[PDB]
Design an enzyme around this catalytic site. Structure first.
Site, PDB file in Angstrom:
ATOM      1  CG  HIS C  39       1.692 -10.264   4.022  1.00 35.84           C
ATOM      2  ND1 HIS C  39       2.131 -11.158   4.976  1.00 35.84           N
ATOM      3  CD2 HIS C  39       0.487  -9.822   4.448  1.00 35.84           C
ATOM      4  CE1 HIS C  39       1.232 -11.245   5.940  1.00 35.84           C
ATOM      5  NE2 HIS C  39       0.225 -10.445   5.643  1.00 35.84           N
ATOM      6  CG  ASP C  61       5.705 -13.130   4.130  1.00 34.31           C
ATOM      7  OD1 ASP C  61       5.896 -11.916   4.328  1.00 34.31           O
ATOM      8  OD2 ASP C  61       4.648 -13.577   3.637  1.00 34.31           O
ATOM      9  CB  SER C 113      -0.891 -10.172   8.984  1.00 34.73           C
ATOM     10  OG  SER C 113      -1.141  -8.806   8.710  1.00 34.73           O
TER      11      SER C 113
END
Lengths: 161, 161, 161
Positions: C39, C61, C113
Protein backbone atom coordinates in the site's frame (compact mmCIF):
# COMPACT_ATOMS: atom_id res chain seq x y z
CA UNK A 1 27.06 70.70 19.95
CA UNK A 2 24.40 72.27 17.72
CA UNK A 3 26.93 74.73 16.29
CA UNK A 4 29.45 71.95 15.60
CA UNK A 5 26.84 69.79 13.87
CA UNK A 6 25.63 72.75 11.83
CA UNK A 7 29.13 73.66 10.64
CA UNK A 8 29.88 70.01 9.84
CA UNK A 9 26.69 69.85 7.77
CA UNK A 10 27.58 73.12 6.05
CA UNK A 11 31.01 71.75 5.13
CA UNK A 12 29.51 68.67 3.46
CA UNK A 13 26.66 70.55 1.74
CA UNK A 14 28.17 73.79 0.40
CA UNK A 15 30.37 74.27 -2.67
CA UNK A 16 31.97 77.62 -3.44
CA UNK A 17 31.21 79.40 -6.71
CA UNK A 18 34.11 81.53 -7.95
CA UNK A 19 34.16 84.10 -10.75
CA UNK A 20 37.41 85.60 -12.07
CA UNK A 21 39.16 83.72 -9.26
CA UNK A 22 37.11 85.25 -6.43
CA UNK A 23 34.11 83.64 -4.75
CA UNK A 24 30.72 85.26 -5.35
CA UNK A 25 28.13 82.76 -4.11
CA UNK A 26 27.47 79.28 -2.79
CA UNK A 27 25.47 76.38 -4.19
CA UNK A 28 24.03 73.96 -1.65
CA UNK A 29 22.54 70.48 -1.78
CA UNK A 30 19.07 70.16 -0.27
CA UNK A 31 17.23 66.86 -0.40
CA UNK A 32 18.09 65.50 -3.85
CA UNK A 33 18.45 68.73 -5.86
CA UNK A 34 21.31 71.17 -6.40
CA UNK A 35 20.11 74.69 -5.60
CA UNK A 36 21.91 77.93 -6.43
CA UNK A 37 20.71 81.53 -6.58
CA UNK A 38 20.22 82.57 -10.18
CA UNK A 39 21.42 86.17 -9.84
CA UNK A 40 24.94 85.14 -8.80
CA UNK A 41 27.34 84.42 -11.66
CA UNK A 42 30.21 81.96 -11.78
CA UNK A 43 30.95 78.25 -11.85
CA UNK A 44 30.84 75.63 -9.10
CA UNK A 45 34.15 74.26 -7.81
CA UNK A 46 33.11 70.70 -8.63
CA UNK A 47 33.52 68.69 -11.83
CA UNK A 48 30.29 66.75 -11.31
CA UNK A 49 28.16 69.75 -10.35
CA UNK A 50 29.48 72.16 -13.00
CA UNK A 51 28.52 69.81 -15.85
CA UNK A 52 24.83 69.48 -14.95
CA UNK A 53 22.00 71.18 -16.84
CA UNK A 54 20.67 73.93 -14.58
CA UNK A 55 16.99 74.75 -14.99
CA UNK A 56 16.41 78.51 -14.98
CA UNK A 57 13.58 80.61 -13.57
CA UNK A 58 13.69 84.38 -13.17
CA UNK A 59 10.54 84.72 -11.06
CA UNK A 60 12.07 82.90 -8.07
CA UNK A 61 15.69 83.87 -8.91
CA UNK A 62 16.74 80.26 -8.45
CA UNK A 63 18.63 77.59 -10.40
CA UNK A 64 17.90 73.93 -9.74
CA UNK A 65 19.25 70.62 -10.98
CA UNK A 66 19.16 66.93 -10.08
CA UNK A 67 22.11 65.63 -8.06
CA UNK A 68 24.00 62.50 -9.17
CA UNK A 69 23.56 59.28 -7.24
CA UNK A 70 26.94 59.28 -5.50
CA UNK A 71 26.31 62.56 -3.64
CA UNK A 72 22.85 61.64 -2.34
CA UNK A 73 24.29 60.60 1.03
CA UNK A 74 26.08 63.99 1.20
CA UNK A 75 22.92 66.12 1.00
CA UNK A 76 20.97 67.86 3.75
CA UNK A 77 17.47 66.89 4.85
CA UNK A 78 14.73 69.40 4.09
CA UNK A 79 11.51 70.49 5.78
CA UNK A 80 8.60 72.89 5.32
CA UNK A 81 7.59 73.79 8.89
CA UNK A 82 8.52 77.28 10.09
CA UNK A 83 7.71 77.78 13.78
CA UNK A 84 8.33 81.18 15.32
CA UNK A 85 11.61 81.63 17.14
CA UNK A 86 15.34 81.22 16.50
CA UNK A 87 17.20 79.40 13.74
CA UNK A 88 20.88 78.74 13.15
CA UNK A 89 23.02 80.39 10.49
CA UNK A 90 26.64 80.47 9.38
CA UNK A 91 27.20 84.02 10.69
CA UNK A 92 25.23 83.51 13.90
CA UNK A 93 21.59 82.93 14.83
CA UNK A 94 18.62 84.20 12.82
CA UNK A 95 15.29 85.30 14.26
CA UNK A 96 11.91 84.43 12.75
CA UNK A 97 9.30 86.97 13.85
CA UNK A 98 6.13 87.93 12.01
CA UNK A 99 6.77 86.11 8.75
CA UNK A 100 10.22 87.67 8.35
CA UNK A 101 13.80 86.46 8.64
CA UNK A 102 15.97 89.10 10.31
CA UNK A 103 19.66 89.31 11.16
CA UNK A 104 20.32 90.48 14.75
CA UNK A 105 23.90 91.43 13.87
CA UNK A 106 23.21 93.36 10.68
CA UNK A 107 26.60 92.15 9.42
CA UNK A 108 25.33 90.82 6.08
CA UNK A 109 27.89 91.26 3.32
CA UNK A 110 27.84 90.67 -0.45
CA UNK A 111 29.12 87.22 -1.34
CA UNK A 112 27.18 85.26 1.31
CA UNK A 113 24.24 84.49 -0.99
CA UNK A 114 23.05 80.90 -1.20
CA UNK A 115 23.94 79.80 2.34
CA UNK A 116 21.08 77.70 3.77
CA UNK A 117 19.24 78.81 6.89
CA UNK A 118 19.22 75.89 9.31
CA UNK A 119 16.71 74.58 11.83
CA UNK A 120 17.16 73.22 15.36
CA UNK A 121 17.48 69.61 14.17
CA UNK A 122 19.78 70.55 11.28
CA UNK A 123 16.97 70.73 8.72
CA UNK A 124 17.14 73.43 6.05
CA UNK A 125 14.39 76.05 6.10
CA UNK A 126 15.17 78.61 3.39
CA UNK A 127 17.97 79.99 1.20
CA UNK A 128 19.54 83.43 1.53
CA UNK A 129 19.53 85.78 -1.46
CA UNK A 130 19.82 89.28 -0.01
CA UNK A 131 18.73 91.60 2.76
CA UNK A 132 17.37 95.07 3.40
CA UNK A 133 18.97 97.48 5.88
CA UNK A 134 16.47 97.99 8.72
CA UNK A 135 18.76 100.35 10.58
CA UNK A 136 20.38 98.17 13.24
CA UNK A 137 18.73 95.03 11.78
CA UNK A 138 18.35 93.60 8.28
CA UNK A 139 15.30 91.84 6.85
CA UNK A 140 16.37 88.91 4.69
CA UNK A 141 15.02 88.26 1.19
CA UNK A 142 14.92 84.46 1.27
CA UNK A 143 13.46 81.62 -0.77
CA UNK A 144 11.46 79.08 1.22
CA UNK A 145 9.30 76.06 0.45
CA UNK A 146 5.66 75.43 1.22
CA UNK A 147 4.26 71.91 1.50
CA UNK A 148 4.65 71.49 -2.26
CA UNK A 149 5.38 75.02 -3.55
CA UNK A 150 8.27 77.47 -3.74
CA UNK A 151 7.73 81.07 -2.68
CA UNK A 152 9.97 84.13 -2.61
CA UNK A 153 9.77 86.65 0.23
CA UNK A 154 11.45 89.97 -0.58
CA UNK A 155 11.18 92.87 1.90
CA UNK A 156 11.16 96.35 0.42
CA UNK A 157 14.53 97.91 -0.34
CA UNK A 158 16.42 94.61 -0.35
CA UNK A 159 19.77 94.35 -2.12
CA UNK A 160 21.13 91.19 -3.72
CA UNK A 161 24.34 90.02 -2.05
CA UNK B 1 15.93 39.31 22.54
CA UNK B 2 14.82 40.90 19.27
CA UNK B 3 17.64 39.27 17.28
CA UNK B 4 16.85 35.79 18.63
CA UNK B 5 13.12 36.25 18.02
CA UNK B 6 13.75 37.46 14.47
CA UNK B 7 16.02 34.48 13.76
CA UNK B 8 13.39 32.13 15.19
CA UNK B 9 10.70 33.63 12.96
CA UNK B 10 12.98 33.52 9.90
CA UNK B 11 13.73 29.80 10.28
CA UNK B 12 10.00 29.05 10.37
CA UNK B 13 9.18 31.45 7.51
CA UNK B 14 12.07 31.36 5.00
CA UNK B 15 12.61 28.58 2.46
CA UNK B 16 15.71 28.59 0.29
CA UNK B 17 15.61 28.35 -3.50
CA UNK B 18 18.42 26.61 -5.38
CA UNK B 19 19.18 26.31 -9.09
CA UNK B 20 21.94 24.00 -10.34
CA UNK B 21 22.70 23.21 -6.71
CA UNK B 22 23.54 26.80 -5.69
CA UNK B 23 21.23 29.10 -3.74
CA UNK B 24 19.81 32.09 -5.61
CA UNK B 25 16.73 33.30 -3.70
CA UNK B 26 14.37 32.88 -0.78
CA UNK B 27 10.63 32.36 -0.34
CA UNK B 28 8.77 33.68 2.68
CA UNK B 29 5.45 32.81 4.32
CA UNK B 30 3.57 36.05 5.02
CA UNK B 31 -0.01 35.92 6.20
CA UNK B 32 -1.40 32.89 4.36
CA UNK B 33 0.49 33.18 1.07
CA UNK B 34 3.84 32.13 -0.35
CA UNK B 35 5.70 35.13 -1.75
CA UNK B 36 8.82 34.73 -3.89
CA UNK B 37 10.47 37.23 -6.25
CA UNK B 38 9.73 36.56 -9.90
CA UNK B 39 13.19 37.34 -11.29
CA UNK B 40 14.93 34.63 -9.25
CA UNK B 41 14.61 31.20 -10.87
CA UNK B 42 14.88 27.77 -9.29
CA UNK B 43 12.75 25.61 -7.01
CA UNK B 44 11.74 25.87 -3.35
CA UNK B 45 13.17 23.26 -0.96
CA UNK B 46 9.77 21.76 -0.15
CA UNK B 47 7.42 19.50 -2.09
CA UNK B 48 4.28 21.20 -0.78
CA UNK B 49 5.57 24.64 -1.77
CA UNK B 50 7.17 23.50 -5.04
CA UNK B 51 3.91 21.88 -6.16
CA UNK B 52 1.85 25.09 -5.92
CA UNK B 53 0.68 26.97 -9.00
CA UNK B 54 2.13 30.48 -8.73
CA UNK B 55 0.43 33.62 -10.02
CA UNK B 56 2.79 35.70 -12.17
CA UNK B 57 2.98 39.49 -12.38
CA UNK B 58 5.96 41.11 -14.08
CA UNK B 59 4.93 44.66 -13.18
CA UNK B 60 5.43 44.06 -9.45
CA UNK B 61 8.10 41.38 -10.03
CA UNK B 62 6.50 38.83 -7.72
CA UNK B 63 4.87 35.40 -7.59
CA UNK B 64 2.23 34.36 -5.06
CA UNK B 65 0.39 31.23 -4.00
CA UNK B 66 -2.06 30.22 -1.29
CA UNK B 67 -0.25 28.14 1.33
CA UNK B 68 -1.50 24.65 2.23
CA UNK B 69 -3.55 24.24 5.37
CA UNK B 70 -0.83 22.72 7.56
CA UNK B 71 1.66 25.60 7.30
CA UNK B 72 -0.95 28.16 8.39
CA UNK B 73 0.61 28.19 11.87
CA UNK B 74 4.15 28.60 10.47
CA UNK B 75 3.77 31.95 8.69
CA UNK B 76 4.91 35.42 9.69
CA UNK B 77 2.29 38.06 10.42
CA UNK B 78 2.33 41.24 8.37
CA UNK B 79 1.66 44.96 8.68
CA UNK B 80 1.17 48.02 6.51
CA UNK B 81 2.40 50.76 8.87
CA UNK B 82 5.94 52.05 8.31
CA UNK B 83 6.95 54.53 11.03
CA UNK B 84 10.14 56.47 10.51
CA UNK B 85 13.04 54.75 12.26
CA UNK B 86 14.96 51.47 12.34
CA UNK B 87 13.87 48.02 11.19
CA UNK B 88 15.40 44.60 11.75
CA UNK B 89 17.02 42.55 9.00
CA UNK B 90 18.96 39.30 8.76
CA UNK B 91 22.15 41.22 7.86
CA UNK B 92 21.91 44.06 10.38
CA UNK B 93 19.60 47.02 10.97
CA UNK B 94 18.01 48.80 8.00
CA UNK B 95 17.29 52.52 7.98
CA UNK B 96 13.96 53.73 6.61
CA UNK B 97 14.38 57.41 5.75
CA UNK B 98 12.16 59.56 3.54
CA UNK B 99 10.53 56.71 1.65
CA UNK B 100 13.89 54.97 1.18
CA UNK B 101 15.11 51.72 2.72
CA UNK B 102 18.88 52.09 3.00
CA UNK B 103 21.60 49.75 4.26
CA UNK B 104 24.06 51.49 6.63
CA UNK B 105 26.95 49.34 5.41
CA UNK B 106 26.32 48.43 1.79
CA UNK B 107 26.93 44.75 2.58
CA UNK B 108 24.07 43.28 0.52
CA UNK B 109 25.20 40.65 -1.95
CA UNK B 110 23.51 38.83 -4.85
CA UNK B 111 21.64 35.74 -3.74
CA UNK B 112 19.89 37.49 -0.83
CA UNK B 113 16.78 38.37 -2.83
CA UNK B 114 13.52 37.52 -1.10
CA UNK B 115 14.73 38.12 2.45
CA UNK B 116 11.95 39.99 4.30
CA UNK B 117 12.39 43.16 6.32
CA UNK B 118 10.88 42.96 9.79
CA UNK B 119 9.38 45.47 12.20
CA UNK B 120 10.01 45.96 15.92
CA UNK B 121 7.30 43.48 16.96
CA UNK B 122 8.40 40.89 14.40
CA UNK B 123 5.87 42.15 11.85
CA UNK B 124 6.94 42.02 8.20
CA UNK B 125 7.09 45.35 6.38
CA UNK B 126 8.54 44.58 2.94
CA UNK B 127 10.45 42.09 0.81
CA UNK B 128 13.90 42.84 -0.62
CA UNK B 129 14.30 42.54 -4.39
CA UNK B 130 17.42 44.50 -5.31
CA UNK B 131 19.71 47.32 -4.30
CA UNK B 132 21.57 50.30 -5.70
CA UNK B 133 25.00 51.70 -4.83
CA UNK B 134 24.34 55.22 -3.50
CA UNK B 135 27.63 56.49 -2.11
CA UNK B 136 28.56 54.57 1.03
CA UNK B 137 24.95 53.39 1.45
CA UNK B 138 22.68 51.09 -0.54
CA UNK B 139 19.10 51.97 -1.43
CA UNK B 140 16.89 48.88 -1.33
CA UNK B 141 14.40 48.10 -4.09
CA UNK B 142 11.62 46.52 -2.05
CA UNK B 143 8.01 45.39 -2.34
CA UNK B 144 5.77 46.96 0.30
CA UNK B 145 2.05 46.89 0.99
CA UNK B 146 -0.58 49.56 1.41
CA UNK B 147 -3.87 48.90 3.19
CA UNK B 148 -5.00 46.71 0.29
CA UNK B 149 -2.63 47.05 -2.70
CA UNK B 150 0.92 46.10 -3.66
CA UNK B 151 3.41 48.84 -4.48
CA UNK B 152 6.98 48.55 -5.74
CA UNK B 153 9.81 51.01 -5.05
CA UNK B 154 12.80 50.97 -7.40
CA UNK B 155 15.58 53.54 -6.90
CA UNK B 156 17.45 54.44 -10.06
CA UNK B 157 20.48 52.30 -10.83
CA UNK B 158 19.24 49.33 -8.82
CA UNK B 159 20.57 45.86 -9.61
CA UNK B 160 18.44 42.76 -9.13
CA UNK B 161 20.25 40.61 -6.57
CA UNK C 1 21.05 -2.85 26.95
CA UNK C 2 18.15 -4.24 24.92
CA UNK C 3 17.19 -0.78 23.65
CA UNK C 4 20.71 -0.09 22.36
CA UNK C 5 20.88 -3.42 20.52
CA UNK C 6 17.43 -2.93 18.98
CA UNK C 7 18.28 0.61 17.87
CA UNK C 8 21.61 -0.52 16.41
CA UNK C 9 19.97 -3.35 14.47
CA UNK C 10 17.18 -1.07 13.24
CA UNK C 11 19.66 1.52 11.96
CA UNK C 12 21.43 -1.13 9.88
CA UNK C 13 18.26 -2.83 8.60
CA UNK C 14 15.82 -0.01 7.71
CA UNK C 15 15.73 2.26 4.66
CA UNK C 16 13.25 5.13 4.48
CA UNK C 17 10.94 5.08 1.47
CA UNK C 18 9.96 8.50 0.14
CA UNK C 19 7.41 9.59 -2.46
CA UNK C 20 7.35 13.13 -3.86
CA UNK C 21 10.07 14.14 -1.42
CA UNK C 22 8.34 12.92 1.77
CA UNK C 23 8.98 9.66 3.60
CA UNK C 24 5.98 7.32 3.83
CA UNK C 25 7.37 3.83 4.51
CA UNK C 26 10.39 1.73 5.34
CA UNK C 27 11.98 -1.26 3.60
CA UNK C 28 13.55 -3.68 6.05
CA UNK C 29 16.23 -6.31 5.49
CA UNK C 30 15.45 -9.80 6.81
CA UNK C 31 17.55 -12.82 5.92
CA UNK C 32 18.35 -12.13 2.27
CA UNK C 33 15.17 -10.39 1.08
CA UNK C 34 13.87 -6.82 0.94
CA UNK C 35 10.27 -6.49 2.15
CA UNK C 36 8.05 -3.48 1.57
CA UNK C 37 4.30 -3.07 2.10
CA UNK C 38 2.28 -2.85 -1.09
CA UNK C 39 0.00 0.00 0.00
CA UNK C 40 2.98 2.33 0.47
CA UNK C 41 4.43 3.75 -2.75
CA UNK C 42 7.63 5.59 -3.56
CA UNK C 43 11.29 4.86 -4.16
CA UNK C 44 13.63 3.41 -1.55
CA UNK C 45 16.29 5.95 -0.59
CA UNK C 46 19.13 3.81 -1.93
CA UNK C 47 20.81 3.24 -5.28
CA UNK C 48 21.14 -0.55 -5.08
CA UNK C 49 17.63 -1.25 -3.80
CA UNK C 50 16.03 0.97 -6.45
CA UNK C 51 17.23 -1.10 -9.42
CA UNK C 52 16.27 -4.49 -7.96
CA UNK C 53 13.26 -6.26 -9.47
CA UNK C 54 10.43 -6.54 -6.94
CA UNK C 55 7.81 -9.29 -6.80
CA UNK C 56 4.41 -7.86 -5.86
CA UNK C 57 1.49 -9.75 -4.34
CA UNK C 58 -1.73 -8.04 -3.29
CA UNK C 59 -3.09 -10.98 -1.28
CA UNK C 60 -0.41 -10.60 1.41
CA UNK C 61 0.11 -6.85 0.82
CA UNK C 62 3.87 -7.16 0.53
CA UNK C 63 6.69 -6.74 -2.00
CA UNK C 64 9.84 -8.84 -1.84
CA UNK C 65 13.14 -8.74 -3.70
CA UNK C 66 16.55 -10.38 -3.48
CA UNK C 67 19.23 -8.30 -1.76
CA UNK C 68 22.66 -7.76 -3.34
CA UNK C 69 25.55 -9.96 -2.28
CA UNK C 70 27.59 -7.28 -0.50
CA UNK C 71 24.60 -6.26 1.65
CA UNK C 72 24.08 -9.76 3.08
CA UNK C 73 25.97 -8.75 6.24
CA UNK C 74 23.73 -5.72 6.93
CA UNK C 75 20.49 -7.65 7.49
CA UNK C 76 18.59 -8.94 10.50
CA UNK C 77 17.98 -12.56 11.46
CA UNK C 78 14.53 -14.15 11.32
CA UNK C 79 12.55 -16.61 13.41
CA UNK C 80 9.07 -18.10 13.60
CA UNK C 81 8.78 -18.98 17.30
CA UNK C 82 6.28 -16.59 18.88
CA UNK C 83 5.71 -17.52 22.53
CA UNK C 84 3.25 -15.49 24.57
CA UNK C 85 4.70 -12.34 26.09
CA UNK C 86 6.28 -9.01 25.17
CA UNK C 87 8.09 -7.92 22.02
CA UNK C 88 10.16 -4.84 21.34
CA UNK C 89 9.35 -2.15 18.79
CA UNK C 90 10.83 1.13 17.59
CA UNK C 91 8.16 3.12 19.45
CA UNK C 92 8.15 1.09 22.67
CA UNK C 93 7.12 -2.42 23.71
CA UNK C 94 4.33 -4.50 22.17
CA UNK C 95 2.30 -7.32 23.70
CA UNK C 96 1.46 -10.63 22.02
CA UNK C 97 -1.70 -12.08 23.56
CA UNK C 98 -4.11 -14.53 21.97
CA UNK C 99 -2.55 -14.45 18.53
CA UNK C 100 -2.75 -10.65 18.33
CA UNK C 101 -0.17 -7.87 18.30
CA UNK C 102 -1.40 -4.92 20.36
CA UNK C 103 -0.03 -1.42 20.99
CA UNK C 104 -0.37 -0.42 24.67
CA UNK C 105 -0.13 3.31 23.94
CA UNK C 106 -2.24 3.67 20.81
CA UNK C 107 0.43 6.06 19.51
CA UNK C 108 0.60 4.54 16.03
CA UNK C 109 0.55 7.19 13.31
CA UNK C 110 0.46 7.09 9.50
CA UNK C 111 3.94 6.56 8.12
CA UNK C 112 4.79 3.76 10.57
CA UNK C 113 4.13 1.06 7.95
CA UNK C 114 7.04 -1.29 7.31
CA UNK C 115 8.65 -1.12 10.75
CA UNK C 116 9.61 -4.64 11.91
CA UNK C 117 8.73 -6.03 15.33
CA UNK C 118 11.69 -7.60 17.09
CA UNK C 119 12.30 -10.52 19.42
CA UNK C 120 14.11 -10.33 22.75
CA UNK C 121 17.22 -11.63 20.96
CA UNK C 122 17.06 -9.01 18.21
CA UNK C 123 15.46 -11.35 15.69
CA UNK C 124 12.73 -9.99 13.42
CA UNK C 125 9.35 -11.71 13.77
CA UNK C 126 6.77 -9.58 11.96
CA UNK C 127 6.27 -6.45 9.85
CA UNK C 128 3.76 -3.76 10.80
CA UNK C 129 1.17 -2.80 8.18
CA UNK C 130 -1.75 -1.13 9.96
CA UNK C 131 -3.63 -0.83 13.21
CA UNK C 132 -7.18 -0.94 14.55
CA UNK C 133 -8.32 1.58 17.15
CA UNK C 134 -9.89 -0.66 19.81
CA UNK C 135 -10.50 1.49 22.87
CA UNK C 136 -7.30 2.25 24.78
CA UNK C 137 -5.34 -0.36 22.79
CA UNK C 138 -4.52 -0.71 19.10
CA UNK C 139 -4.55 -4.13 17.44
CA UNK C 140 -1.76 -4.37 14.88
CA UNK C 141 -2.47 -5.70 11.39
CA UNK C 142 0.87 -7.33 10.56
CA UNK C 143 2.41 -9.79 8.11
CA UNK C 144 4.14 -12.69 9.84
CA UNK C 145 5.98 -15.83 8.76
CA UNK C 146 5.11 -19.36 9.80
CA UNK C 147 7.53 -22.28 9.49
CA UNK C 148 6.88 -22.16 5.74
CA UNK C 149 3.77 -20.06 4.98
CA UNK C 150 3.38 -16.28 4.91
CA UNK C 151 0.15 -15.35 6.68
CA UNK C 152 -1.61 -12.02 7.12
CA UNK C 153 -3.58 -11.11 10.25
CA UNK C 154 -5.98 -8.18 9.80
CA UNK C 155 -8.39 -7.28 12.62
CA UNK C 156 -11.71 -5.66 11.83
CA UNK C 157 -11.68 -1.90 11.44
CA UNK C 158 -7.94 -1.54 10.88
CA UNK C 159 -6.55 1.31 8.79
CA UNK C 160 -3.58 1.38 6.43
CA UNK C 161 -0.77 3.55 7.78
Amino acid sequence: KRERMCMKIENDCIFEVKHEGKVTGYACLVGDKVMKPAHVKGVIDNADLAKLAFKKSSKYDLECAQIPVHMRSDASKYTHEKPEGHYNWHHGAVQYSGGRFTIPTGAGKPGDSGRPIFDNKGRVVAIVLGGANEGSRTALSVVTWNKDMVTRVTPEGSEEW
